[PDB]
């Protein structure tokens, strides 16, 4: 009764052949005649100084002004990016915080890491002081990423190879997303919030149905860990960043890889990815000192953000599209346009 082992290989071939049948022309062939973007030369407009050690994560508030960052110094800082002043500095229990998130409402932030817990902080208490409103316990491995759906719902990814949807009020996992065979490193919610994508150390990305808890599609191609993942702004595609020194673009409806973004002299891993507002530019952070701005349609490197003295660990583009934030192991965030 290991016709199941044959059957698995039959189905893998059918999927491969179905994908191949849809591969009639490449994205590059299709975008060959459009004008290139030209030289993108963004400048550092603001530097956020205040962290005492490596920055590990950041996330913009939906107002395109406030952002939260997490650091080895054991602080979560909420920054006013326009003035460079801090708004809040939240002391954490440990240094080893790997992710932070800003709720779309602006009412809460979240973070976690080697504690294996997603902590939720109320920014708008009656007292006027920030304090822990919930500690989401359940993962049996490190918290790698988290993103609020709303004030009562957050999605987490973990080194335990699962993702989960949480009801914050009850503190319970409402849905558990099982399927990955390696540490899950990053997640990105679809614009409409019905779907999300995860990237993991099994070198695959998975599309999940949020309500029904099922993996709908699995995307392969990367040769090593996927560390970063981000939806294209219309929700029909997403980009990944990997230890294999490439970013890749995957399409949901064609169910396959559309493009690789790479260069012969890039040997190090990608830590973070994000699209510009229109999706035309793909920005990626690297283990060396820089961020590369890629033409997402043509795969040309349009530019470089060179202003850190160590790893660019994280980045994000504002909802209004006005600026990119980079966070680094050199202990600074920088705001670029």
């Amino acid at each position: 009764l290991d016709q199941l082992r044959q059957e698995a290989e039959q189905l893998k071939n059918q999927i491969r052949d179905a994908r191949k049948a849809c591969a009639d022309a490449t994205l590059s062939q299709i975008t060959n005649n459009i004008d290139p973007v030209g030289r993108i030369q963004m400048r550092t407009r603001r530097t956020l100084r205040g962290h005492l050690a490596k920055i590990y994560a950041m996330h913009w508030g939906t107002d395109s002004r406030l952002l939260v960052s997490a650091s080895q110094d054991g602080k979560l800082i909420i920054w006013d990016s326009y003035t460079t002043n801090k708004v809040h500095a939240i002391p954490l229990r440990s240094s080893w915080v790997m992710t932070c998130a800003y709720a779309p409402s602006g009412n809460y932030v979240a973070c976690g890491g080697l504690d294996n817990i997603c902590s939720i902080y109320n920014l708008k208490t009656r007292e006027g002081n920030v304090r822990v409103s919930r500690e989401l316990a359940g993962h049996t491995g490190y918290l790698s990423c988290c993103r609020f759906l709303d004030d009562n719902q957050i999605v987490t990814s973990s080194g335990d190879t699962t993702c989960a949807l949480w009801d914050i009020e009850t503190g319970q996992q409402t849905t558990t997303f099982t399927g990955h065979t390696g540490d899950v490193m990053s997640l990105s919610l679809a614009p409409d919030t019905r779907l999300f994508v995860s990237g993991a150390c099994d070198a695959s990305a998975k599309l999940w149905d949020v309500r029904e808890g099922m993996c709908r599609q699995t995307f392969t191609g990367h040769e090593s860990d996927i560390n970063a993942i981000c939806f294209f702004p219309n929700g029909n595609a997403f980009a990944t960043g990997s230890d294999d020194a490439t970013c890749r673009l995957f399409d949901l409806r064609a169910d396959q890889e559309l493009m690789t973004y790479s260069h012969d002299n890039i040997i190090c891993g990608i830590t973070s990815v994000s699209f510009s507002k229109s999706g035309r530019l793909l920005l990626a952070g690297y283990d060396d000192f820089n961020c590369n701005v890629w033409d997402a349609l043509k795969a040309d490197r349009a530019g470089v953000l060179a202003g850190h003295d160590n790893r660019v660990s994280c980045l994000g583009v504002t909802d209004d599209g006005m600026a990119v934030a980079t966070g680094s192991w050199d202990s600074f965030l920088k705001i670029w346009n």
Binding site: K54, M98, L114, Y142, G159, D183, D225, N227, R311
Partner: peptide, 13 residues
């Protein structure tokens, strides 16, 4: 698994 997290955090041991 801890090894990936140590690389991400910049720890050695």
């Amino acid at each position: 698994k801890r090894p990936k997290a140590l690389k991400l955090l910049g720890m050695e041991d």
